[PDB]
Structure 1
Amino acid sequence: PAPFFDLGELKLWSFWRAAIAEFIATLLFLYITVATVIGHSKETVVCGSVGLLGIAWAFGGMIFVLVYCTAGISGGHINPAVTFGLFLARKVSLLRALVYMIAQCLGAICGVGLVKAFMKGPYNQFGGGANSVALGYNKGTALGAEIIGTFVLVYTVFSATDPKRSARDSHVPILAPLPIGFAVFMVHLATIPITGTGINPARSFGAAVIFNSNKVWDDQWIFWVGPFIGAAVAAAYHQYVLRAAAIKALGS
């Protein structure tokens, strides 16, 4: 029976800085990625943007950069679904988890907020970076895609945990950033045409909050439930089926 918090949460100066790092990181994540999306969507020259490929790179490349910078401070989650998966495997206390998830959402809101402020017209005209079910797919397909996508991501996160090194003043495992960055990249390549790719409830929520349309709000549940389920299946797979929690993957 896992306690609500532990002594690492009483190291308040570090715990506060971990929270800030998650907040600022998720802000930057959303700023760079949604600005990339809007910059793409608004372009009038045919084949004169960074393209869907550029967009998939923005999301994957930013998770690489942000986990690189924050792994030693917070554990580098940038993603309620990642925090949720790790909480389920008891690598993160409930109190740390909820503090991280709030930070991530508020940061996502602020980041999309910044994109709207910089490019209000194109932002509103071209869908505000929001996830929703694309034409021709049903909600069940959307949800399945969000589950398997988040699974790929959360399973990569588990395999990328360092069993010996932890974020400052915590037991939160350090994460190897490149493979997690690449997993995000891969999932976007597959999933952009179906939902835009969520796999990150905060990323989806921030976009929904700022864009604020009925259609986007109606689909929003898929981007919470899908990722949380995917994360849960990844935690069970890694912990229970493969028994791989002590394994250190050799990065490349």
Structure 2
Amino acid sequence: SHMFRKLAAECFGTFWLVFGGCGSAVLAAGFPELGIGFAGVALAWGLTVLTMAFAVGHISGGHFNPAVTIGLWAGGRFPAKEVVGYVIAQVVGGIVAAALLYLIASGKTGFDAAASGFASNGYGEHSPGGYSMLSALVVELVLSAGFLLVIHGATDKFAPAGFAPIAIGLALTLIGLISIPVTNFSVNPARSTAVAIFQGGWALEQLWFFWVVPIVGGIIGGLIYRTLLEK
């Protein structure tokens, strides 16, 4: 099974993630009177990964996330060499979603990706609820780590075969349930990028945080499972 497809799967996967989990935020979360709120976005998030982990996890591993791929290298599950391909696939996928989405969102008067934020991840004054950078750090580091704690745990050799996608996608929804008000929900650098580019302002100015923190978090989780819990 040639590597062009893994990339293709990681690519489509991450697009699907950014199309659904950001679409929901942008189009449905706030819709007058019948909108899906944070709950529904958190759910949507999980489901993109549930669904695509099932659809192509059996191909690429089903990461859809730079922090996952990296954090998976840290846990000794993924090879050094293949990491850079995934992270690019992942990022490029996300961008294409952010555009098609951006274009879609544009068909309804009122739309302003700048003003509105375009589901871009922020901290401090750009925390959906005004949380400090410190809160943002703790929440993203704790939740990134746990995410990969859950990924490694669920894909453990001894862990019941197949359920992994439920275990993970749901994790993400849980993470969403928790973290939307602090970071607008991230733990996925490809995702913060995809829409940061289109918000094109502060979202681009803080974007680094949402590479650095979740990646380190992903390493911290990978090492917490690999050393402490595994073997």
- Do they fold alike, i.e. is TM over 0.5? yes
Confirm or deny: 8 A CA contact 2:98 2:195 kept in the other structure. yes
Distance in 2 separating the partners of 1:68 and 1:207: 25
- Per-residue displacement from partner, 1:57-84 (whole Å, max 9, x unpaired)? 0101111111111111100000111100
Confirm or deny: 8 A CA contact 2:50 2:169 kept in the other structure. yes
| Counterpart pick for 2:213 among 203, 216, 226 | 226
Partner of 2:198: 210
Partner of 1:238: 225
| Counterpart pick for 1:114 among 86, 92, 100 | 100
| Counterpart pick for 2:117 among 117, 127, 131 | 127
Partner of 1:10: none
Distance in 1 separating the partners of 2:29 and 2:222: 36
Distance in 1 separating the partners of 2:100 and 2:167: 28
| Counterpart pick for 2:34 among 34, 48, 56 | 48
Tell me the amino acid that sits aligned with residue 145 of structure 2.
F
Q: Secondary structure at the match of 1:73?
A: helix
**Deviation, structure 1 residue 175:** 7.8
Partner of 1:33: 21
Distance in 1 separating the partners of 2:150 and 2:92: 25
Moved over 6 A (4+): none
Question: Which structure shows the bigger proportion of residues in helix conformation?
Answer: 2
Q: Secondary structure at the match of 2:81?
A: helix
Tell me the amino acid that sits aligned with residue 210 of structure 1.
F
- CA-based RMSD of the aligned residues comes to 2.0
Distance in 2 separating the partners of 1:149 and 1:88: 16
Distance in 2 separating the partners of 1:179 and 1:138: 30
Count of paired positions: 222
Alignment of 1:1-252 (within 5 A): 14-40=2-28, 43=31, 45=32, 47-120=33-106, 122=111, 124=113, 125-133=115-123, 134=127, 135-163=129-157, 176-213=164-201, 215-242=202-229, 244-245=230-231
Distance in 1 separating the partners of 2:83 and 2:53: 17
- Per-residue displacement from partner, 1:71-105 (whole Å, max 9, x unpaired)? 11100000111100111223222221110000000
**Deviation, structure 1 residue 40:** 2.8
Confirm or deny: 8 A CA contact 2:13 2:52 kept in the other structure. yes
Confirm or deny: 8 A CA contact 1:162 1:175 kept in the other structure. no
Distance in 2 separating the partners of 1:123 and 1:17: 36
**Deviation, structure 1 residue 210:** 2.2
Change (3 A) 1:42 1:181: closer
Distance in 2 separating the partners of 1:95 and 1:128: 34
**Deviation, structure 1 residue 41:** 5.0
Change (3 A) 1:175 1:14: farther
**Deviation, structure 1 residue 23:** 0.4
Distance in 2 separating the partners of 1:89 and 1:106: 25
TM-score scaled by length of structure 1: 0.82
